[PDB]
Amino acid sequence: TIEERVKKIIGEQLGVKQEEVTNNASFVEDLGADSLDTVELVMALEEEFDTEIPDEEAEKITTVQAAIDYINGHQ
Amino acid sequence: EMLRPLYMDVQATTPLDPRVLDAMLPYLINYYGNPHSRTHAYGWESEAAMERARQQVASLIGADPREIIFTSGATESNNIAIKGVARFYRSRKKHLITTQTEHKCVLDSCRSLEAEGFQVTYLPVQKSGIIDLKELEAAIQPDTSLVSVMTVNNEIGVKQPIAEIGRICSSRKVYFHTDAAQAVGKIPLDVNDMKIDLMSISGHKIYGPKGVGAIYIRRRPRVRVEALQGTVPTPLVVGLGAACEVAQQEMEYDHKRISKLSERLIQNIMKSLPDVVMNGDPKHHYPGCINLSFAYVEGESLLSLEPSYVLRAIGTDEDLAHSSIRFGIGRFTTEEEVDYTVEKCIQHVKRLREMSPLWEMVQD
């Protein structure tokens, strides 16, 4: 129900339009990103809404489904 | 430099006193530097700092230093007090008493206790904002554990008979907690002359830093609380202690000045804008918090949402209590801020009384 907002933020930070917004996609393998862009991505997700993500949970966010199932799993 | 009227922010009324920040600088420096540049004395310097802060807070409220516990603010202090006493005494004390004009956090905690199985009665307030002592004294049950009445109302600015409430609670072996967040350092408080058992203290309300508070828990006799389902940083604790000491030395001067400026604001507003009423009993009013209701301003005064639930408890009509203004005057408030605020208030009330809100209301 809030996966579209996550995909919107990922699309905004990584510079991808609303057509390549595929669910279950790796950041480094399917979106052309690296560890630094990933850190800035997690910081963007925790930056849009006032919610915090620890380092252990942020390191596990290497795909899209990891980010979709971590902002809902910690409400 | 552009001024700001005395009704925009409630935090703007209590800025950080430069003496407090000056007390906090060395601990900020030794704090926000990662624990590899700290010296082999940080532990002692922090135990000593927190002990001095305890002595300052305690000395302001007439308590013993061992009775001061540092929290993250008056909210955590409230939860510790009500939920601590209630959850610790779930054996033979399952009843709690409070007022309908308390802060939102206290009411929320009492609703949480009600959801977990505690019986709570919310005492109504009279049209003066003061509770009826006969209603409180007649509402104590054999299983009543805690009575929580704030010392000053943050919306109307009226003082509750804290000493008498403490006398009534101690006369029936009932614990007495008070939310003194809007009262500490501004009006005199003695935890011994007033039969107070638990007290909540906010740092940024007394010109201290944000994110720090305190709670007084009596030890003679010993009052106990249950831990809630963490450690506040040292520079903020130092700041709370410094703010309490400065407040103790400046309370009389600040009260005289704030009374003068408050009377200036109210007299200048009533002199030019008729049909204005002041909420709260003037004979038991603290001057720092003013709350004025204006008559013929239909709709809402925007500067969809809910009205004021404190003004509804003092028997004020929906439309009258809907558009109301809470002015704040503090230690650093200047006369120019007061005159600019009364001018802006006159302009806005005069403008809004000749208009109707239907235009902005229909914007879809």
Binding site: - | P15, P18, L25, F332, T333, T334
Partner: protein, 76 residues
């Protein structure tokens, strides 16, 4: 115990207080110093006078630190 040094302390505290980068702190400082010296006027106990002078010197140090550091953070 110093006659001219008390006036020099008043002058120094006013001059340093006028350099506050903030309006509320500057106005409060000048007002509180003025009202403070005016209120403690005609005090005879030399111990109380010495105490007031000591507090005035410490507060002068506070005003100095806060004015200088605040000025170092005061972006204009």
């Amino acid at each position: 115990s110093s006659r001219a040094q008390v006036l020099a302390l008043y002058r120094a505290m006013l001059r340093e207080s006028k350099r506050f980068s903030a309006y509320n702190y500057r106005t409060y400082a000048v007002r509180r110093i003025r009202d403070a010296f005016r209120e403690n006027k005609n005090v005879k106990d030399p111990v109380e006078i010495q105490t007031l002078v000591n507090k005035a010197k410490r507060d002068l140090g506070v005003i100095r630190r806060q004015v200088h550091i605040g000025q170092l953070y005061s972006t204009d």
